[PDB]
Design a protein around this ligand. Structure first.
Ligand SMILES: [Pb+2]
Ligand SMILES: [Zn+2]
Ligand SMILES: [Zn+2]
Ligand SMILES: [Zn+2]
Lengths: 36, 36, 36
């Protein structure tokens, strides 16, 4: 439905935001190794 | 169109799922280095 | 609205594309360490 589409998009946006933060966390660990 | 919007959202969701798995794979390699 | 939904999906797709490229950049640094 249209309402399910709206909720699906919101859930997709929240998943991306979580992935962006996970990537930032991995970057921090990788930079610690790269400059260790 | 509406139908193109539905397909675009499904394709976007599948791309995210693939990125989540790629990030998990990179995390595994980074953890091997971090604890090596 | 419907038009806001279309724009929200486009913005979400562009965020994912940027994350895919960021992940590729982190992979390159991790591979340099993994084979160093
Ligand atoms: Pb994403
Ligand atoms: Zn660095
Ligand atoms: Zn660790
Ligand atoms: Zn490698």
């Amino acid at each position: 439905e249209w309402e399910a589409l709206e909720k699906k998009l919101a859930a997709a946006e929240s998943k991306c935001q979580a992935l962006e933060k996970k990537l930032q966390a991995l970057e921090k660990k990788l930079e610690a190794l790269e400059h260790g």
